[PDB]
Amino acid sequence: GVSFEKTPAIKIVGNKFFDSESGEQFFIKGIAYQLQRSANGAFETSYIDALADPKICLRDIPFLKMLGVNTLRVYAIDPTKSHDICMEALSAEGMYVLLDLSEPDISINRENPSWDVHIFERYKSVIDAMSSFPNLLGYFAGNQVTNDHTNTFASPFVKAAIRDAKEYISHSNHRKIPVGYSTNDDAMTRDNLARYFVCGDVKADFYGINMYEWCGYSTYGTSGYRERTKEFEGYPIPVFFSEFGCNLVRPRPFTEVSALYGNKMSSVWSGGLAYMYFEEENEYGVVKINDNDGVDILPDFKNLKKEFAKADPKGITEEEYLTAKEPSVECPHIAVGVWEANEKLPETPDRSKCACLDEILPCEIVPFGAESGKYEEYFSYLCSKVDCSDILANGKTGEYGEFSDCSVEQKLSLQLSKLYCKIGANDRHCPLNDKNVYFNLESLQPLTSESICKNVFDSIRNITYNHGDY
């Protein structure tokens, strides 16, 4: 492999993936690849980006090759770093990457969801860092955001992210890399979630399930795989297991691989990715990295290797697939306490509008290093003293306030500033005890003719001056 020629870009046509050069169907034979430490005090990323460190990726690629994978799933990259060496070394061995756009500390919050300028900036940074690589198979815009019947209202926020990532990619000069979603496997929500992500005017491009139903020496029938396969027959977009490898008893046989690539399942599923390469506290690994940073192969590795080696999925060509076929789904009805994802999505976050808040507000909280753990406490307090309707985002009802798309810190700054103005002590003491709070002297500078922040200023002046105290 000299450059990227061993990995032609994969495209989606209907509900299958195809090699863009040969037209042969593409099946994912994958593994999750993400290394945990082991940095905070020295301001390094909390996560490790193995794809930006040749020392790590060049160690592991020979073992990934032994294993027989053609795809990795990666959960977090650092978009400020180069990825050319590791992505090309993967390509040279015929390996592709499925990549989440989020990172552990910048993701859609299932406990208080918003689709905002900060998360969108994160997504765009990843897209711009990784889209040059023909072996970038697809991006995940969310990973099990909704996870049970109590947080289904997070799903509209994820669909907005899919829409906005797709639009950003379409307007860019990049290859049109598909954007999809990865979900869990909760019985009460699974059918609604699959329908929701292909309903209405916005759709995921592909759909991964984190699939742990087959434990030990199970079968197609007894595991649940037969039932899931029947559920997904004719589902309009490609589907695959984004994770598999139940670890109730170890060593894991990985006999589910025989079913997955067998004739019955290969007509519906596009393959899957084992979870996971590294042995960490959760006991899902196939290798252990020792104290000197060497790779020790574990019993699970040999089992998975043997299963991948004999998996020979029967695909069909693009031409055969398209023969006699030309590739609008109703969204699930709302039922209080069961399914609460409105079809009406939040709008694309507006960076320019939100940026005006940074300039004009008297009281602000600095994003860098802020203790986000205290934010629930801070909102409960602030919203008991001023009216937080202007930042409320309700995915149940499809109601989104004027500043609901701004960053969490911008939202806090807006309510903190409202409270400062309501109290009216005019003493530059912002009424919130956090080291990241400060009085913004730029707020004392009048907007000139003709500032691009005049409209936001008018909004904020109206909101602060007319706060319901008659």
UniProtKB/Swiss-Prot annotation:
Splits internally a 1,3-beta-glucan molecule and transfers the newly generated reducing end (the donor) to the non-reducing end of another 1,3-beta-glucan molecule (the acceptor) forming a 1,3-beta linkage, resulting in the elongation of 1,3-beta-glucan chains in the cell wall. Involved in spore wall assembly. One of its GO terms (molecular function) is 1,3-beta-glucanosyltransferase activity. It is an enzyme of class 2 (transferase). (1,3-beta-D-glucosyl)n 1 binds at Y75, S102, E103, P104, D105, I106, S107, I108, N109, R110, N143, Y275. N-glycosylated. GO terms for cellular component: cytoplasm; fungal-type cell wall; fungal-type vacuole; plasma membrane; side of membrane. Keywords: Cell membrane, Cell wall biogenesis/degradation, Disulfide bond, Glycoprotein, GPI-anchor, Lipoprotein, Membrane, Signal, Transferase. It is found in: Cell membrane. GO terms for biological process: ascospore wall assembly; fungal-type cell wall (1->3)-beta-D-glucan biosynthetic process; fungal-type cell wall beta-glucan biosynthetic process; fungal-type cell wall organization. Disulfide bonds join C57-C86, C199-C331, C215-C246, C354-C406, C356-C453, C363-C430, C383-C388. Belongs to the glycosyl hydrolase 72 family. This is 1,3-beta-glucanosyltransferase GAS2. It comes from Saccharomyces cerevisiae (strain ATCC 204508 / S288c) (Baker's yeast).
